[PDB]
């Protein structure tokens, strides 16, 4: 009925010995996009050209972690458990209120239209292109008491060449072609979903460095050739070759059982403006050209933080493109001069297992040495996976995405979003929503032309998302106290992680999940 609420606002976290369940609700506003029509989209810009469509529909996105975890909760989670992975989810939209706007002259009036319908469907079948997954605004806001605007749905189409235009292959997906539920106030929508078994994300830092796992005290039983000649001078000395049983201490020489990492090199820049070479953002030598990129169908796509690699700590004066950058509290606009106002994610913790972003993978003999010809070593920058390699994935972040859909392709290797998160073949479905059109008074004599005059409307209501996370406690045997993340903030005039006098809420730092320790 019109008079009855169709759902209660509950946001909660319930913790278990084995599983924690998060639940949060938010209020949303839904405009009328593109005055009700699908629009072709395309621009051709050389290293950017793209093509696609913009839709009258909007969608709900809960892909950021902070959507379901209050800071404290996130804390609880990461200081206590080694791994976590999502198990099941369920969503419900309710208290739909459709508003109609009179828009008188000078003043715009708004009043409820009780008999109006907003339509929601979610598609399981994954027939619509998935977009919820990468790098984008629209997720519910972290702070509960913040109303948000449902994002408009638009999708990309395959672009052939450096020039944007469409081939027969390009396709059009029309949301109205799908069956969807129609609601009015007093109507509600609900759906459930079960995640697929997925590797627990590792929420620990290695307490051992891969290269040396051996017993410091003993020495291998293998021998290596130590020197072709005597002395410490490169090209002089007595001819004889000498072999020696690998002894305790010459660890760098120990034959090991594993190779540390897959790797792609990244350019490095210094946070101090002064240190960098001059590089423009446009023109023949715009930065893009010098930053590690992957050429695809004639178009440079700059590699996103790439195959997981070690990166300078957050405080460090140098930073690489490999690390993710978050706004930070103080920044006002879209652009800023000093990087002291930004937040940098860093994977120092990964260093124990795999190569550094700005440094190389290693160096290989790139030549066959000989008495008359000197040995030459080649610098290796790109290294595909090799038998016996072991690496760590990029960590997840409080404000980082949670899942991402694994491309529907013949081949994929070690799916783990590179931006961080769990790779799913069938990820939480995008739930679409749109305000049904309505018509302005219409002409008395019939005209075939499609109607174009519509009443102005917008809707609002609350959505509630609940996720059941499966986690695993630590159970370590380490004796010395671990590192844990605790605020440690100095005396503050207006406390952190809280709304302020203005009433504004902003997240102070970016937070990872690897504080606990574990050995290899």
Chain residues binding ligand D5M by CB under 6 A are 198-199, 414-416, 422-423
* Residue 409: CB minimum distance to ligand D5M, A: 14
Q: How far is residue 75's CA from residue 83's CA, in Å, rounded to a whole number?
A: 14
- Is residue 373 within 8 Å of 399, Cβ to Cβ? no
* Residue 470: CB minimum distance to a copy of itself, A: 4
- Give yes or no for residue 189 binding a copy of itself (CB under 8 A): no
Which residues face 362 on adjacent strands?
380
Q: Which of 472, 483, 467, 480 is nearest to 516 (CA)?
A: 483
* Contact positions with a copy of itself (CB under 8 A) in 479-518: 479-489, 491-503, 507, 511-518
DSSP, residue by residue, 321-366: TTS-EE--SS--SS--S-GGGSEE---GGGGGTS-BSSS-SEEEE-
- Give yes or no for residue 463 binding a copy of itself (CB under 8 A): yes
Question: What residues contact residue 362 under an 8 Å CB cut-off, 6+ apart?
Answer: 355, 380, 383
- Taking the least distance from each CB to a copy of itself, the nearer of 96 and 128 is 128
Q: Which of 315, 363, 364 is nearest to 340 (CA)?
A: 315
* Residue 427: CB minimum distance to ligand D5M, A: 10
- Is residue 438 within 8 Å of 455, Cβ to Cβ? yes
- Give yes or no for residue 357 binding a copy of itself (CB under 8 A): no
Region from 34-42, 94-102, 133-141, 260-268 binding a copy of itself, contact rule CB under 8 A: 34-42
* Residue 376: CB minimum distance to a copy of itself, A: 27
**Coil, strand or helix: which one is 65?**
helix
Q: Provide the b/e sequence for 431-469 (b: ≥16 CB within 10 Å).
A: bbbbbbbbeeeeeeeeeeeeeeeebbbbbbbbbbbbbbb
DSSP, residue by residue, 266-286: --EEESSGGGSPP--SSSTT-
- Taking the least distance from each CB to ligand D5M, the nearer of 85 and 99 is 85
Q: State the DSSP code for 290.
A: H
Q: Pick from 98, 118, 128, 343 the residue near a copy of itself by CB under 8 A.
A: 128
* Residue 72: CB minimum distance to ligand D5M, A: 26
Among ligand D5M, a copy of itself, none, residue 416 binds (CB under 5-8 Å by kind) = ligand D5M
Is the four-CA dihedral 303, 304, 308, 309 of positive or negative sign? positive
* Residue 451: CB minimum distance to ligand D5M, A: 47
Helix (H) or strand (E) holding 288: helix 287-290
- Is residue 210 within 8 Å of 258, Cβ to Cβ? yes
Among a copy of itself, ligand D5M, none, residue 199 binds (CB under 5-8 Å by kind) = ligand D5M
- Give yes or no for residue 122 binding a copy of itself (CB under 8 A): no
- Taking the least distance from each CB to ligand D5M, the nearer of 58 and 400 is 400
- Taking the least distance from each CB to a copy of itself, the nearer of 45 and 257 is 45
Q: State the DSSP code for 171.
A: -
* Contact positions with a copy of itself (CB under 8 A) in 131-170: 157, 165-170
* Contact positions with a copy of itself (CB under 8 A) in 396-435: 407-409
Q: Nearest-5° angle of CA 502, CA 505, CA 511?
A: 150
Among ligand D5M, a copy of itself, none, residue 414 binds (CB under 5-8 Å by kind) = ligand D5M
**Coil, strand or helix: which one is 30?**
strand
- Is residue 432 within 8 Å of 58, Cβ to Cβ? yes
* Residue 253: CB minimum distance to a copy of itself, A: 38
- Taking the least distance from each CB to ligand D5M, the nearer of 262 and 423 is 423
CB-based closest residue to ligand D5M? 423
- Give yes or no for residue 40 binding a copy of itself (CB under 8 A): yes
Q: State the DSSP code for 312.
A: -
- Whole-number Cα distances in Å, 84 to 78, 90, 404: 9, 18, 16
Q: How far is residue 153's CA from residue 33's CA, in Å, rounded to a whole number?
A: 9
Region from 146-154, 292-300, 369-377, 477-485 binding a copy of itself, contact rule CB under 8 A: 477-485
Q: How far is residue 309's CA from residue 348's CA, in Å, rounded to a whole number?
A: 9
* Residue 58: CB minimum distance to a copy of itself, A: 12
Among ligand D5M, a copy of itself, none, residue 507 binds (CB under 5-8 Å by kind) = a copy of itself
* Residue 413: CB minimum distance to ligand D5M, A: 7
- Taking the least distance from each CB to ligand D5M, the nearer of 344 and 422 is 422
Among ligand D5M, a copy of itself, none, residue 469 binds (CB under 5-8 Å by kind) = a copy of itself
* Contact positions with a copy of itself (CB under 8 A) in 53-92: 53, 60, 62, 66-68, 70-72, 74-75, 77-92
How many residues of this chain interact with a copy of itself, rule: CB under 8 A? 112
């Amino acid at each position: 009925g019109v008079g009855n609420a169709s759902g209660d606002w509950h946001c909660d976290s319930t913790w278990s010995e084995g599983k924690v369940t998060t639940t949060s609700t938010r209020t949303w506003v839904l405009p009328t996009y593109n005055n009700h029509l699908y629009l072709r989209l395309g621009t051709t810009s050389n290293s950017n050209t793209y093509n696609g469509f913009s839709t009258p529909w909007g969608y709900f996105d809960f892909n950021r972690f902070h959507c379901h975890f209050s800071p404290r909760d996130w804390q609880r989670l990461i200081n206590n458990n080694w791994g976590l992975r999502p198990k099941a989810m369920r969503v419900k939209i309710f208290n739909i209120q459709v508003k109609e706007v009179t828009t008188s002259n000078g003043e715009t009036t708004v009043a409820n239209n009780l008999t109006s319908t907003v339509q929601i469907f979610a598609d399981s079948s994954y027939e619509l292109p998935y977009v919820m997954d990468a790098g984008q605004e629209g997720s519910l806001p972290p702070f509960p008491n913040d109303v948000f605007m449902v994002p408009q749905y638009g999708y990309c189409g395959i672009v052939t060449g450096e020039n944007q235009n469409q081939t027969d292959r390009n396709a059009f997906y029309c949301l109205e072609y799908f069956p969807s539920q129609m609601l009015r106030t007093g109507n509600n929508f609900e759906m459930a979903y079960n995640f697929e078994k997925v590797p627990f994300h590792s929420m620990y830092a290695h307490s051992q460095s891969l290269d040396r796992l051996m017993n410091p005290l003993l020495d291998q039983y293998l021998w290596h050739l130590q020197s072709t000649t005597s002395g410490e001078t490169l090209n002089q000395g007595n001819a004889a070759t000498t072999f020696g049983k690998i002894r305790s201490g010459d660890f760098a020489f120990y034959r090991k059982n594993w190779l540390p990492g897959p790797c792609v090199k990244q350019q490095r820049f210094s946070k101090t403006a002064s240190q960098n070479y001059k590089i423009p953002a446009s023109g023949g030598n715009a930065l893009l050209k010098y930053d590690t990129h992957y050429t695809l169908n004639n178009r440079w796509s700059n590699i996103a933080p790439g195959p997981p690699m070690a990166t300078a700590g957050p405080s460090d004066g140098d930073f690489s493109n490999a690390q993710l950058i978050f706004p930070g509290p103080s920044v006002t606009g879209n652009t800023t001069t000093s990087a002291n106002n930004l937040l940098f994610t860093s994977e120092e913790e990964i260093a124990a297992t795999n190569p550094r972003d700005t440094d190389m993978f290693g160096q290989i003999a790139d030549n066959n040495q000989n008495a008359t010809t000197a040995p030459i070593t080649g610098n290796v920058t790109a290294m595909g996976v090799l038998p016996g390699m072991v690496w760590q994935n990029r960590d997840i972040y409080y404000q980082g995405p949670i899942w991402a859909k694994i491309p529907h392709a013949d081949g994929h290797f070690h799916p783990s979003p590179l931006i961080g998160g769990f790779g799913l073949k069938h990820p939480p479905p995008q739930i679409f929503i749109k305000n049904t059109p309505v018509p302005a008074n219409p002409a008395t004599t019939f005209t075939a032309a499609r109607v174009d005059s519509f009443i102005t409307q917008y809707s609002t209501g609350q959505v509630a998302v609940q996720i059941e996370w499966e986690i695993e406690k630590e159970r370590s045997k380490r004796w010395n106290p671990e590192v844990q993340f605790t605020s440690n903030y100095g005396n503050q005039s207006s406390m952190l992680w809280a709304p302020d006098t203005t009433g504004k809420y902003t997240e102070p730092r970016v937070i990872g999940s690897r504080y606990l320790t574990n050995h290899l």
